[PDB]
Amino acid sequence: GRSLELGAADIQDLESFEAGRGALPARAYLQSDAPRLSLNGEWQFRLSPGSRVAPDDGWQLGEALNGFESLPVPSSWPMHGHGAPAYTNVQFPFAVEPPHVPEANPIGDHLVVFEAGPEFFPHALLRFDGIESAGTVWLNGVELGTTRGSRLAHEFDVSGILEQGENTLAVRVAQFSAASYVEDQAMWWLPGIFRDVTLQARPAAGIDDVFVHAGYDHITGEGILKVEASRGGQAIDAVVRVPELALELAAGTEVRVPAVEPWSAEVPKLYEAAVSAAGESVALQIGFRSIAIEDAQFKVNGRRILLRGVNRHEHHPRLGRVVPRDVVEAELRLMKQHNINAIRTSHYPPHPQFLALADQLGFYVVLECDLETHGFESAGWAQNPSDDPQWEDALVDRMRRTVERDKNHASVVMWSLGNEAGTGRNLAAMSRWTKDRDPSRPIHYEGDWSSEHVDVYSRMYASQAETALIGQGIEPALNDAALDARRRAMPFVLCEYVHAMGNGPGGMSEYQALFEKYPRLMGGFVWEWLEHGITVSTADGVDHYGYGGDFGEEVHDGNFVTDGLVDADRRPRPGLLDFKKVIEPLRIDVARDWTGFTLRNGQDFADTSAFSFRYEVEADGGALDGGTVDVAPVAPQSETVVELPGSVAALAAGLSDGRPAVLTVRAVLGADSAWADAGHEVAWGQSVREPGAPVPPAPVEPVQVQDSELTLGPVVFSRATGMPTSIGGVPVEKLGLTLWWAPTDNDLGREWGGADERPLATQWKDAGLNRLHTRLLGISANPGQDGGETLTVRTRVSAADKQYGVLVDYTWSTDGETVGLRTQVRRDGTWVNRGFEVEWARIGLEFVLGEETELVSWFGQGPHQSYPDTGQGARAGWFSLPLAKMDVEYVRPQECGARSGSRSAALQLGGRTLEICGDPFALTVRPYSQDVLDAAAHRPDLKADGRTYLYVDHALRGVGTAACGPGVLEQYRLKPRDADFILTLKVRS
Amino acid sequence: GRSLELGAADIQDLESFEAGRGALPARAYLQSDAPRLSLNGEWQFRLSPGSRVAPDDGWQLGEALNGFESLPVPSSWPMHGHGAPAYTNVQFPFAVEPPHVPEANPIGDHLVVFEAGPEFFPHALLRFDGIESAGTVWLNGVELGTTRGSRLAHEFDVSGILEQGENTLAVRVAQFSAASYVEDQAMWWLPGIFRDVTLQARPAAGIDDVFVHAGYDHITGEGILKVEASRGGQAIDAVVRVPELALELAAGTEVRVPAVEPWSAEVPKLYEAAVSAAGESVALQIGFRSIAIEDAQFKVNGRRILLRGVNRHEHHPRLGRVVPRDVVEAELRLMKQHNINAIRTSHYPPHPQFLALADQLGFYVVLECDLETHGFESAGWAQNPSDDPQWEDALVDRMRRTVERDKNHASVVMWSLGNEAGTGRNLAAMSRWTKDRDPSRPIHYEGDWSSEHVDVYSRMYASQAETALIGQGIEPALNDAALDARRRAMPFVLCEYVHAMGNGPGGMSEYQALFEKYPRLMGGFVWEWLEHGITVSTADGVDHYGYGGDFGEEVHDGNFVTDGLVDADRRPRPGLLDFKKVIEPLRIDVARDWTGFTLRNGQDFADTSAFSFRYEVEADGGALDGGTVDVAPVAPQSETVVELPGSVAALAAGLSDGRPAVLTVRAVLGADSAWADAGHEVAWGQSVREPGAPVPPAPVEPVQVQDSELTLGPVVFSRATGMPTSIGGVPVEKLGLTLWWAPTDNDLGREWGGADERPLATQWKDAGLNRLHTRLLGISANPGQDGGETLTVRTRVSAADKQYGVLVDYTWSTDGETVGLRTQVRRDGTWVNRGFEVEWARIGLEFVLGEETELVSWFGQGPHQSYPDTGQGARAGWFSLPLAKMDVEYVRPQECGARSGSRSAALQLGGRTLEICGDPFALTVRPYSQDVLDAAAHRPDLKADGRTYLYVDHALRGVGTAACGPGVLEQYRLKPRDADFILTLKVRS
Ligand SMILES: OC[C@H]1O[C@@H](O)[C@H](O)[C@@H](O)[C@H]1O
Ligand SMILES: OC[C@H]1O[C@@H](O)[C@H](O)[C@@H](O)[C@H]1O
Ligand SMILES: OC[C@H]1O[C@@H](O)[C@H](O)[C@@H](O)[C@H]1O
Ligand SMILES: OC[C@H]1O[C@@H](O)[C@H](O)[C@@H](O)[C@H]1O
């Protein structure tokens, strides 16, 4: 049996169950004075479709290069025209038959030439901080070894192989390997050398690894310091210095520092330090803090903390898995600016530079190992690597490298074994290894609800209801009494919650109230921080984001990648603006009589000395009063009542009733910080004096009659239809009832529970809410006042093939100045379809106007959108925006931009202005129709058609988080019902 | 309360529950010598969007016409650019709130000027044979009345209103009315005056109505004749004459004719007749036949008959509901040419000219009333007009007019109350009325399974299994013993079965065998005769059919309209070719030794004297023998063994074994008939001498080896992939396994039963059968014979995210002339997905070739396609066709064109020819890919890409009728399994 296949040897290596070979022991990423040369820059690159046709020519030596072109390094090579991105959620892009790999497997050959000076001898190494997913490395033709673990560091000794002067480094990178089976994160598949490549010397009498142990005794205030140092795995002599604390001690010994200032996300105190031996010195930043679990609470420095967190993937719209440092610093400052205090590195270790920034700015970090086997769930977890003993060594290695690299950073308060990888013996081995190596950080893993091998109980997307049961410690018991006992003593954290995809997330406040009420609840991490949008440039310079499927992939999960609080360029979504308010660290309850406000300090450690408390009274015209009030600092977890100047209460008392006015109290930064300038807003509260009920016009104008038209003051009606065609000279091309909106991403998902497995969008489509039809029943003019008349138009709205409907009556009235419009809705028949009760998106009206709108003004909530279960961040005030800025640039267009709680509005159409008033309504204005919005898959598919689509809603439905997790909560649902609402219009030129 | 709405009076009339007003009594359509003038021609026409804007100007008088243009009459006015067609299946296109109508309701004003000569006085009438759906008629400004019942005749007296000379006739037609609620047939909605408009004089002493009663005593052979005649509802004096029978008798008296030749679809004997009084004479055609039910059988003239039927809608691709007479005669001849003997006028009376043609050519007709309320089912039948007493008069009227018009035609053997209209008191009133008026024809209605008010038990799409239970009279009992007793004594008919949508129908033979075995089974009517395709002409002159949705309708049911045995232009689909064979009236079983054949006469009345029995022996070269054999006529329902000339058996006996040869016996017409010429084929049978097993080549050629290629005789392989790239100079761009085909219309429907409600196409999509991926495992050359070698390529086929797969091994061998190819398939893992066992469409191979193919030849079954549960009409022989004629022009492209039972094949590519041989396989050749075929929604979306896609299948799955009714029967399913098949190839230039 002759064997004639090509590349069988390269494939066997890619199919290996083992960790990479030929590498130095795993250690910490350390700032050293040892000489170093970054090989980052312009490399040469060649791509083959698979191993069997990957040329075995002499390319590794660098001479006679055939078929190479320039490429930057680090890089995600699909970001530069070589192949294309492919995004899948749970599903693998290849056949599930481990350890085998497909035949279509991009192979990337990388090569660079560099100069090695004398200072890199006799000893040196090469360091690779990230290769996705399988790398083989040669130096001057000699093989160093292989890399496994795509976001993990590898180091190769080049002593006696690195030559003085010019050297040639070659790296072969395969996209898919056996390791892909354990790297099934929901994100873009992006092969490449995507992190630093560095040459580092290792002088004699140096330092290879360091392990900081900096604890805090919260009773005495002492610091407990012990800095370990080793060479070749052996503890060595070395001296530690921290100038600020008047300390010089030996490595390996534990000392009590009489008084330290503890480290926390709120106060990230960092003492500079150096560990030095004869040949090498290491620069450290040390944060004193101790982590402990007691009374079923997660405590730092003796206090239960509340995690205000997000899940952070690493992604950049033009460079993929390469995130420039300027972008890292930016987004982390942006996080702090929105009151975030915690980060989960979903689902792999980040760039090693991330850790120091986290220590400095202040975040509680859950550092997570690179491991996820989600794609094995659909087959009942059969062949899951997490329980296959042949994978033990490879998975322990992943955890080892994860722990060693970042074990010195005070910001890491939990080690996480991975994400959605089931349960198995290998996961238990990873946990046992970590607990032995570093018992100073509790262990996290959500995949095993029994929680046998962890220290905190973690779940994702648990309902508000179950969260409250857990907060009270009365969730259902595990069958094993011993394991149930353990878990009931564990604090609870939501590693992912309030899925922030598209319009939403809804129901954040409900979670937060539980967090504040129940100590056992640690808090939660929003999924997720950013949208993984990829910029696509088109003809005429139009720029938009692409998502799953837009790059010609055979298997994908669509727009699930754009599920973030900010877009790929870090521009806030409305959800982040709401999130900031929900998690605000201070609560300000302004008194109704404007005499003062209650101030609760929600922080865990800091008092209120960093904040300046300011007040301002705003009214119709401008601002009437304002200033700053001094507050004796308030301790954490306590409250006080702050008096306001009597002048404020006097304004309120002498306010002619019916005049609108808003008192706003804010807590801003008194001075610059590392993450924001002075005056940055942190918390706020308001008290509103509402405008009185709008005076309904006197019906003293009669109805003129003609053959095909009616007129009632500034309004013109069509006799045939009964609907306005003009108001004050403004063409009304249509007016009608609305019960539907263009489905959100959440409306496109299932609400599990109940016998109805259809998404809300499908329920609506089956019911006909998107294609309503109106029948005219009657037109009638009725006696008004002193000659005038009202005009009642009676209609019935329904849909083809349906028997249910609603009766809508429009009653118009006018005095010549302002048009009054009453609308009555009455449901007719039983609103059931395919055996389930139909629900409504809204109860409102759609005005279609023939003119374009330039500007929208309103008194209500703003500046940004607000729906019944969102809008926490929208405050009471006066707002005005150009039309285009009323919209929201979601990647898949969908319902958005409604302004709930509006009392008045004003649209500028050319030279005229249309004013709407009435009891609280929601306001939306768009230059396109609802059907155009529902059809559009990307922003370019939206086109203005010269009209103005105006929406005035009396009732609205919530948005929820049904795309992943709970749907709209009961209190925000909208069942069919009768309704009645009044409204006044006016046009002025 | 002033009332200001427009058109409220016209709308109230459209909402009327009552029949049309002001019309003459319902009567028969009669050929009379009274003067007549057809007003058909070029009319003037105007369209308004609704009643409220329909002008009330002076248009009815004909002077100062504003906005009218020319339009033909009769017409379906959406067929001429006024609006557009809209097709819905079950669902109404308007809100379901009877009797109300929508505001978007096209109003069509029609007008013509004509001359009335002296012979139209003093009495005359105007006759309208069809107006959809509500007409108001004026003559010279004077209102005559209104029409209700869209396919029913109305007559209006114009005495004292018709003026001598020039007259002006005006008709206002509304598309939607209260009557639309009872005209919910599955078809295009097409308003208009779509049938004849005729002026007819009514001289004094004339004849208004006639009622023929022509029975047959099958014991004596006597005819029982009684011709009734009436004027103004009163029986009158009149004399009846039938020359051929030597008869002159008075109307109203019953006589025994000593000897008549009975009428039947097989022998449609018609005696000419005339009923005459002083002023008028009527021409009649009389067929003597008596209908009776006894021993739970449906009998004509004392014999149980077998219905070979189709459901006939009226439709024309360019004129809509207007079917020219030349097209009627054509399609009915086409029906007879395919052995059909029965017609159901689904679901309304046809054009009155249809009846005479049915009497002449010979069909058993189920004449069905215009009534269907299907759209009320989705709401639990609430508000169903069939049980609403306010609709009684309007529904009795529909049945009255239905019965009166056609009561004289022997071809009508059943009256049908309507279709899918539920159960209700009005349906019972329609039945009571019919039984009293005409007790000579049993009553049919499927909507009430209890069968309380009918004479035959009717069902639609009952499984073969339930049909067999009913054939034995052991179906489950009704709860009411008295009704169960009645129904068990009733014969059973399938008014709709073997849904003929797209590829199919499958499972026809199984039904037919039950029809022949069980007397209680009357037979069945295929759904349906024609596709309702509408021709759409595009730039460059390309012509294709449109279906539901292609005309911009808001609500539609897609391609369900193209569900016919022939296309809109009456070109046969493969299903009709199979249907003809299944229902063939004679069975011919040719003996294996070629000594003779068994002949069963399946007819009910006629013997075999009309047929000439002919034989022919065909072989490789040409024909070897042939002739005609004389058969003593065989009586109905008996059989005989016909000897063939000894010369035929001698050829078979002296045939060198392994040589293929086919003996075919045919029954053709001995002489011309009214529906076909002499030599037309009616029945056939065959005996085949198969070719011997193909000799596998001697493996005496070795494997040449190169860096990137292997070669084994005329074959070139790629070392990387292991797959052919050449055979004899022909580029092979790809070769691989197939388990999937582009879903048929049947595959897009649900198979109710079992916990899996997904259509087969969705099951396949979820499982990944459409996106298979192959991994190379090994390549190996093995010792052959006298130096030669075999080449085994080992592969594993699967799909992304799936663990199941198949192992496919290709073993090649050659002697230099012919390539031998063995293929072994072994399933690997459990083929389950989303909790249900995956099924396969096929087990085969796809050859993709770089050259185009001009011609395809094969020995097997043809000329037309054949799948496991179809192809009855495909016979054994030798066939050759240009590539384009191997395809099938279904309106929605889908899997089709496979040739099952193939033993050899030959493709001509330019100058060369590729030959395939082996054990029985299925052959398909296309100029495009399977994905292009699945994506295409219409024919133009198919584009040849310069390649040749060749499919060789070892196993195939059935097609069934799951689009509506049973899916693939158990024995034709294809579960995943191991398989093995051999095959030889050869290229000759
Ligand atoms: O103590 C106040 C601060 O608390 C931090 O945890 C948060 O990240 C900051 O944005 C700020 O709110
Ligand atoms: O092994 C994976 C499973 O683990 C269980 O603890 C959990 O309840 C399941 O939902 C699933 O995640
Ligand atoms: O008796 C033979 C004939 O029977 C008729 O019913 C049929 O319509 C004809 O096509 C032919 O088959
Ligand atoms: O009233 C309509 C119903 O009539 C019943 O006899 C039948 O079983 C049902 O399927 C439905 O057709």
Residue B448 Cα: closest atom of ligand 4: 6
Please name the amino acid found at residue B935: A
Please say whether the beta carbons of B216 and B290 come within 8 A: yes
How are beta strands A543-546 and A715-718 bridged, if at all?
A: unpaired
Phi, psi of A648, deg, nearest 5: -70, -50
Looking up residue B186, the CATH number of its domain turns out to be 2.60.120.260
**Would the CB atoms of B103 and A774 count as touching at under 8 Å?**
yes
What does the alpha-carbon distance between residue B984 and residue B918 come to, in Å, rounded to a whole number? Answer: 6
What does the alpha-carbon distance between residue B558 and residue B891 come to, in Å, rounded to a whole number? Answer: 11
What does the alpha-carbon distance between residue A395 and residue A397 come to, in Å, rounded to a whole number? Answer: 5
Residue B339 Cα: closest atom of ligand 3: 10
Question: What's the token pair of residue B872?
Answer: 């009855």
Residue B597 lies in a domain: no
What does the alpha-carbon distance between residue B52 and residue A719 come to, in Å, rounded to a whole number? Answer: 9
Resolution in A: 2.1
Residue B245 lies in a domain: no
Q: Which of A312, A332, A341 to mutate to test the pocket of ligand 1 (most atoms within 8 A of CB)?
A: A341
Question: What's the token pair of residue B196?
Answer: 């004849």
Residues of chain A positioned with their CB less than 8 A from the CB of B96: 798, 801-803
3 state SS of A471:
helix
Q: Which residues pair with B819 in a beta bridge?
A: B814, B985
Question: What's the token pair of residue A264?
Answer: 């926390």
Phi, psi of A947, deg, nearest 5: -105, 180
Please say whether the beta carbons of A460 and A494 come within 8 A: yes
Please say whether the beta carbons of B208 and B107 come within 8 A: no
What does the alpha-carbon distance between residue A465 and residue A472 come to, in Å, rounded to a whole number? Answer: 11
**Would the CB atoms of A800 and B95 count as touching at under 8 Å?**
yes
Ligand 3 within 6 A of B581 CB? no
Ligand 2 within 6 A of A448 CB? yes
Chain centre to alpha carbon of residue B948: 33
**Cβ < 6 A, ligand 1 pocket:** A 265-266, 336, 339-341, 585, 603, 606, 682
What does the alpha-carbon distance between residue A460 and residue A419 come to, in Å, rounded to a whole number? Answer: 11
Nearest CA among B60, B83, B167, B59 for reference residue B132: B83
Question: What's the token pair of residue A593?
Answer: 């009589």
Q: What is the dihedral angle through the alpha carbons of B29, B32, B34, B36, rounded to the nearest 10 degrees?
A: 60
Pair (B197, B298) in one structural domain: no
Chain centre to alpha carbon of residue A352: 22
What does the alpha-carbon distance between residue B375 and residue B89 come to, in Å, rounded to a whole number? Answer: 9
Residue A67 lies in a domain: yes
If one counts every other C-beta atom within 10 angstroms of the C-beta of residue B352, the result is 18
- DSSP H helices, A818-936, are 930-935
Q: What is the largest CA-CA distance in chain B?
A: 109
* Residue nearest ligand 4's atom 7 by CA: B449
Q: Which residues contact A467 (CB under 8 A, 6 or more apart)?
A: A492, A494, A511, A514, A521
Q: Which of A3, A4, A556, A831 to mutate to probe the B interface, most B CBs <10 Å?
A: A4
Cα–ligand 3 centroid distance for B333 (angstroms): 11
Looking up residue B895, the CATH number of its domain turns out to be 2.70.98.10
Break sites following residues in chain B (C–N > 2.5 A): none
Question: What's the token pair of residue B408?
Answer: 């004289």
Q: Which residues pair with A292 in a beta bridge?
A: A299
B96 vs A91, A383, A802: nearest CB: A802
**Cβ < 6 A, ligand 4 pocket:** B 422-423, 447-449
Pair (B193, B323) in one structural domain: no
**Would the CB atoms of A1 and B775 count as touching at under 8 Å?**
no
Chain centre to alpha carbon of residue B361: 19
**Residue span of the structural domain in which B194 resides:** 8-201
Q: Which residues pair with A142 in a beta bridge?
A: A139
Residue A877 lies in a domain: yes
Q: What is the DSSP letter of A160?
A: T
Q: How many CA atoms lie within 13 A of B177 on its CB side?
A: 28
Pair (B50, B190) in one structural domain: yes
Please say whether the beta carbons of A960 and A497 come within 8 A: no
What does the alpha-carbon distance between residue B457 and residue B477 come to, in Å, rounded to a whole number? Answer: 13
3 state SS of A461:
coil
Question: What's the token pair of residue B495?
Answer: 């008014």
The alpha-carbon radius of gyration of chain A (Å, integer) is 32
Question: What's the token pair of residue B655?
Answer: 């045939």
| Geometric angle at alpha carbon B599, from B598 and B601, rounded to 5° | 150
Separation in Å, CA of A182 to nearest CA in chain B: 14
Q: Which of B519, B545, B580 is the last residue of a domain?
A: B580
What does the alpha-carbon distance between residue B571 and residue A798 come to, in Å, rounded to a whole number? Answer: 42
Residue A147 lies in a domain: yes
Q: Which of A580, A606, A627 is the last residue of a domain?
A: A580
Residue A575 lies in a domain: yes
3-state secondary structure B175-197: CCCHHHHHECCCEEECCEECCCE
How are beta strands B832-833 and B724-727 bridged, if at all?
A: unpaired
Q: Which residues contact A8 (CB under 8 A, 6 or more apart)?
A: none
- A41-48: strand order across its sheet: A69-73, A41-48, A107-116, A165-174, A134-139, A142-148
The alpha-carbon radius of gyration of chain B (Å, integer) is 32
Ligand 3 within 6 A of B667 CB? no
Task: Give the residue numbers of B annotated as catalytic, written as ranges.
Answer: 420, 496
Q: Which residues pair with B710 in a beta bridge?
A: B705, B717
Dump the DSSP string for B661-703.
EEEEEEEEESS--SS--TT-EEEEEEEEEPPPPPPPPP-----
Nearest CA among B12, B552, B555 for reference residue A772: B555
Angle between helices B508-517 and B574-582 (to 10 degrees): 20
Please identify which residue in the block is written with the tokens 């997720």.
A528
Dihedral (CA of B295, B300, B304, B308) sign: negative
What does the alpha-carbon distance between residue A480 and residue B499 come to, in Å, rounded to a whole number? Answer: 58
Residue A945 lies in a domain: yes
What does the alpha-carbon distance between residue B667 and residue B681 come to, in Å, rounded to a whole number? Answer: 6
What does the alpha-carbon distance between residue B568 and residue A65 come to, in Å, rounded to a whole number? Answer: 65
Pair (B160, B306) in one structural domain: no
Question: In chain A, what are the helix, strand and coil shares in percent, each to the nearest 5?
Answer: 15, 40, 45
What does the alpha-carbon distance between residue A629 and residue B774 come to, in Å, rounded to a whole number? Answer: 74
- Chain A contact present for B832, CB below 8 A: no
- Chain A contact present for B827, CB below 8 A: no
Q: Which residues contact B656 (CB under 8 A, 6 or more apart)?
A: none
What does the alpha-carbon distance between residue A83 and residue A95 come to, in Å, rounded to a whole number? Answer: 20
Question: What's the token pair of residue A959?
Answer: 């948005």
- Chain A contact present for B53, CB below 8 A: yes
Please identify which residue in the block is written with the tokens 């395969």.
A174
Please say whether the beta carbons of A375 and A219 come within 8 A: no
Angle between helices A508-517 and A574-582 (to 10 degrees): 20
Q: How many CA atoms lie within 13 A of A892 on its CB side?
A: 24
Interface size between A and B, measured as CB pairs under 8 A: 144
Question: In chain B, what are the helix, strand and coil shares in percent, each to the nearest 5?
Answer: 15, 40, 45
Element (DSSP H or E) covering residue B401:
helix B392-406
Please say whether the beta carbons of B841 and B768 come within 8 A: no
Q: Which of A580, A611, A626 is the last residue of a domain?
A: A580
Nearest CA among B710, B713, B738 for reference residue B725: B710
| Count of domains forming chain A | 3
Nearest CA among B981, B950, B986, B694 for reference residue B811: B981
> For residue A582, what are the CA distances in angstroms to A451, A591, B126?
30, 20, 79
Cα–ligand 1 centroid distance for A339 (angstroms): 5
Q: Which residues pair with A844 in a beta bridge?
A: A738, A953
Strands (E), A739-874: 773-783, 789-798, 805-814, 819-828, 832-833, 836-837, 842-849, 855-862
- Chain B contact present for A779, CB below 8 A: yes
Residue B712 lies in a domain: yes
Please say whether the beta carbons of A724 and A716 come within 8 A: yes
**Would the CB atoms of B2 and A379 count as touching at under 8 Å?**
no
Residues of chain B positioned with their CB less than 8 A from the CB of A91: 800-801
Separation in Å, CA of B383 to nearest CA in chain A: 9
Question: What's the token pair of residue B298?
Answer: 């449906």
What does the alpha-carbon distance between residue A465 and residue A469 come to, in Å, rounded to a whole number? Answer: 7
- Chain B contact present for A794, CB below 8 A: no
- A271-276: strand order across its sheet: A31-32, A281-286, A271-276, A239-242, A247-250
Please say whether the beta carbons of B764 and B740 come within 8 A: yes
Q: What is the dihedral angle through the alpha carbons of A78, A81, A84, A87, rounded to the nearest 10 degrees?
A: 50
What does the alpha-carbon distance between residue A562 and residue A532 come to, in Å, rounded to a whole number? Answer: 6
Question: What's the token pair of residue B46?
Answer: 């105007």
- DSSP H helices, A547-685, are 574-582, 646-653
**In chain A, which among 358-387 make CB contacts under 8 A with chain B?**
375, 378-379, 382-383
Separation in Å, CA of B344 to nearest CA in chain A: 28
Pair (B978, B854) in one structural domain: yes
Please say whether the beta carbons of A413 and A443 come within 8 A: no
What does the alpha-carbon distance between residue B854 and residue B793 come to, in Å, rounded to a whole number? Answer: 31
Question: What's the token pair of residue B332?
Answer: 């009915």
Residues of chain A positioned with their CB less than 8 A from the CB of B774: 103
Ligand 3 within 6 A of B339 CB? yes
Q: Which residues pair with B143 in a beta bridge?
A: B138
How are beta strands B86-88 and B187-189 bridged, if at all?
A: antiparallel
- Chain B contact present for A800, CB below 8 A: yes
Cα–ligand 2 centroid distance for A447 (angstroms): 6
What does the alpha-carbon distance between residue A893 and residue A937 come to, in Å, rounded to a whole number? Answer: 6
What does the alpha-carbon distance between residue B716 and residue B730 come to, in Å, rounded to a whole number? Answer: 10
Residues of chain A positioned with their CB less than 8 A from the CB of B93: 800-801
Nearest CA among B954, B871, B875, B483 for reference residue B687: B875
Angle between helices B508-517 and B464-471 (to 10 degrees): 0
Nearest CA among A687, A867, A299, A6 for reference residue B710: A6
3 state SS of A147:
strand
Pair (A915, A771) in one structural domain: yes
Please say whether the beta carbons of A566 and A580 come within 8 A: no
Pair (A158, A302) in one structural domain: no
**Would the CB atoms of A801 and B722 count as touching at under 8 Å?**
no
B801 vs A92, A703, A719: nearest CB: A92
**Would the CB atoms of B378 and A721 count as touching at under 8 Å?**
no
Residues of chain A positioned with their CB less than 8 A from the CB of B779: 3-5
**Would the CB atoms of B800 and A100 count as touching at under 8 Å?**
no
Cα–ligand 1 centroid distance for A466 (angstroms): 28
Looking up residue B432, the CATH number of its domain turns out to be 3.20.20.80
What does the alpha-carbon distance between residue A170 and residue A114 come to, in Å, rounded to a whole number? Answer: 11
What does the alpha-carbon distance between residue B835 and residue B758 come to, in Å, rounded to a whole number? Answer: 12
B103 vs A93, A710, A776: nearest CB: A776
> For residue B1, what are the CA distances in angstroms to A707, A779, A809, A835?
19, 9, 15, 41
Ligand 2 within 6 A of A31 CB? no
Strands (E), B39-106: 41-48, 69-73, 86-88
Q: Burial letters for A348-376: b for 16+ Cβ neighbours within 10 Å, e otherwise?
A: bbbbbbbbbbbbbbbbbbbbbbbbbbbbb
Please name the amino acid found at residue A762: T
Question: What's the token pair of residue B506?
Answer: 């499958």
What does the alpha-carbon distance between residue A154 and residue A129 come to, in Å, rounded to a whole number? Answer: 6
Task: State the ligand closest to the CA atom of A338.
Answer: 1
Pair (B820, B966) in one structural domain: yes
